[PDB]
Amino acid sequence: AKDVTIIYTNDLHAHVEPYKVPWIADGKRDIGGWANITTLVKQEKAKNKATWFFDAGDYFTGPYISSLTKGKAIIDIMNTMPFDAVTIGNHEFDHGWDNTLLQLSQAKFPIVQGNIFYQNSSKSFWDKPYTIIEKDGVKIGVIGLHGVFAFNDTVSAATRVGIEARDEIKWLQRYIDELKGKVDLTVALIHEGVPARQSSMDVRRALDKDIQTASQVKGLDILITGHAHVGTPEPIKVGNTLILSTDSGGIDVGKLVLDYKEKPHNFTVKNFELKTIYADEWKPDQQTKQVIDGWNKKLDEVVQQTVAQSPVELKRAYGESASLGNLAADALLAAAGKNTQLALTNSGGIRNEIPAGAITMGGVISTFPFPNELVTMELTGKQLRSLMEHGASLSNGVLQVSKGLEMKYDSSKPVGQRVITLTLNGKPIEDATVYHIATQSFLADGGDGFTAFTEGKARNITGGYYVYHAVVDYFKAGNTITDEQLNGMRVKDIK
Numbered sequence: 001a002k003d004v005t006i007i008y009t010n011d012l013h014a015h016v017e018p019y020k021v022p023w024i025a026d027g028k029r030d031i032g033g034w035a036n037i038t039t040l041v042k043q044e045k046a047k048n049k050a051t052w053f054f055d056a057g058d059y060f061t062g063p064y065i066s067s068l069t070k071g072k073a074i075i076d077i078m079n080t081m082p083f084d085a086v087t088i089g090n091h092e093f094d095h096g097w098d099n100t101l102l103q104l105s106q107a108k109f110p111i112v113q114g115n116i117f118y119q120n121s122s123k124s125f126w127d128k129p130y131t132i133i134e135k136d137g138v139k140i141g142v143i144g145l146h147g148v149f150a151f152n153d154t155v156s157a158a159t160r161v162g163i164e165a166r167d168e169i170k171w172l173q174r175y176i177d178e179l180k181g182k183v184d185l186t187v188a189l190i191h192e193g194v195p196a197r198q199s200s201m202d203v204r205r206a207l208d209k210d211i212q213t214a215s216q217v218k219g220l221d222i223l224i225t226g227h228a229h230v231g232t233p234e235p236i237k238v239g240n241t242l243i244l245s246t247d248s249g250g251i252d253v254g255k256l257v258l259d260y261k262e263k264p265h266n267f268t269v270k271n272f273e274l275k276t277i278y279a280d281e282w283k284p285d286q287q288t289k290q291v292i293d294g295w296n297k298k299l300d301e302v303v304q305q306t307v308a309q310s311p312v313e314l315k316r317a318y319g320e321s322a323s324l325g326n327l328a329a330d331a332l333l334a335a336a337g338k339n340t341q342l343a344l345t346n347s348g349g350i351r352n353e354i355p356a357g358a359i360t361m362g363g364v365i366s367t368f369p370f371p372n373e374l375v376t377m378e379l380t381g382k383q384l385r386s387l388m389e390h391g392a393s394l395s396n397g398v399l400q401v402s403k404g405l406e407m408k409y410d411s412s413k414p415v416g417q418r419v420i421t422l423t424l425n426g427k428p429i430e431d432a433t434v435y436h437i438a439t440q441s442f443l444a445d446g447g448d449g450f451t452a453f454t455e456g457k458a459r460n461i462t463g464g465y466y467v468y469h470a471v472v473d474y475f476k477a478g479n480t481i482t483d484e485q486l487n488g489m490r491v492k493d494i495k
């Protein structure tokens with residue numbers, strides 16, 4: 001018998017330094033930090049030779065250190081961490097697939113990705129579908145895959161032109177088959193399912209896709225999943241497969257210890273822990289911290305600039321309005337100008353709280369990190385209601401809306417029949433009426449399954465002018481945070 005230890009993360013989302021989470025110790029205790037995670041993994045690797053560290057994608061995008069470097073800083077920091085293999089998540093595409101190739105080429109650790117291809121081609125996007133990593137005489141085959149639904153749902157259209165993910169189940173079984181007689185254990189790092197709830201609290205999230213995947217293939221030992229940000233405090237067992245995940249952002253790190261007795265694909269679980277990382281319990285790895293610090297110094301000049309103030313922490317919600325959604329929608333509306341009647345933006349695009357006090361450029365970027373450009377268009381009331389119904393389905397959260405738009409839905413009704421009321425400036429939205437709206441390019445191209453945006457007429461896109469520019473400009477124009485932004489339930493579940 002040999003201890004075989006697998007440590008894993010997913011959806012780290014550029015949370016390179018320790019930070020507060022409103023629902024952990026009431027936002028009063030720092031969690032995570034990648035230098036802390038480095039210390040954890042280094043200590044485990046020092047204790048047992050047969051120890052692997054894996055990540056299931058979405059290390060890009062969150063705190064400004066990612067967006068402002070197009071993920072370059074993130075690869076540099078990860079190069080100081082002892083990863084044995086990672087896969088590619090949707091967020092690694094956020095600055096375009098050419099940037100994906102460029103940045104990830106700089107990784108000093110293996111990256112596996114076996115089901116993204118050039119459209120109308122058999123050519124693979126990445127060059128390595130799986131790899132074998134041997135430690136202390138034990139060989140682990142590691143496969144990387146992205147779910148097709150998740151890829152189409154969450155990769156911005158503008159960043160995936162000419163590439164696509166293909167049937168993840170077909171490829172998973174193929175790679176399991178190719179590895180079967182070559183390895184002791186087969187692990188898949190799969191980025192798939194429903195996107196994470198983005199909330200300061202609020203919409204049920206689970207790992208149903210991953211259970212389905214495990215039930216559909218034969219011979220997979222371990223399935224480490226990312227995308228949903230739903231941790232597995234105990235492994236989910238499906239046949240002989242164990243499904244593992246974390247709560248994202250380095251809030252916790254999973255550790256699985258197996259008893260392996262030299263019979264390939266046969267093992268028992270010795271111990272499992274999904275451990276919450278409290279910064280005050282860890283010594284940060286000095287090399288990782290040094291690389292983070294160097295990047296912060298480079299970016300400081302730009303990010304430190306004060307752009308606004310708030311009397312209270314600004315929050316987000318996935319199933320209803322919250323202050324950051326109200327603000328962003330009002331900012332898009334202001335930027336579009338007086339011919340525009342309303343603005344809509346997505347809850348999943350709002351990635352962090354903004355603290356009370358002086359608001360800085362860095363804070364705004366961390367909350368609104370995406371290169372999603374301002375778009376104006378004309379939609380009918382029927383098209384608007386369709387978008388509202390898609391929001392109310394909660395598959396991708398509700399749309400956040402500008403002042404004057406009010407929507408009430410009831411989540412206990414069937415999907416597609418949940419909207420109860422929908423008014424603009426007190427008047428019901430009407431099917432045939434044309435409305436002048438503002439949004440951004442992720443939604444305009446049908447992101448998050450909001451298909452009706454693609455039917456908009458009289459479309460105008462402002463190149464290079466992103467949500468965070470709109471927010472900064474809202475304050476530059478002399479607007480402030482209002483009480484109705486802080487407290488207005490413009491979108492509400494009345495269940």
Ligand SMILES: Nc1ccn([C@@H]2O[C@H](CO)[C@@H](O)[C@H]2O)c(=O)n1
Pocket residue numbers: 094153154155156195196346347348349350370371372396442448
């Ligand atoms: N360019 C982009 C790319 C992604 N997203 C948001 O990120 C969510 C997935 O984490 C997606 O569900 C979506 O809400 C975004 O707002 N803009």
Ligand SMILES: [Cl-]
Pocket residue numbers: 146147148149150151191192193194209
């Ligand atoms: Cl999927």
Ligand SMILES: [Fe+3]
Pocket residue numbers: 058089090091154191226227228
């Ligand atoms: Fe994802």
Ligand SMILES: [Mn+2]
Pocket residue numbers: 011013058091196227228229
């Ligand atoms: Mn993610």
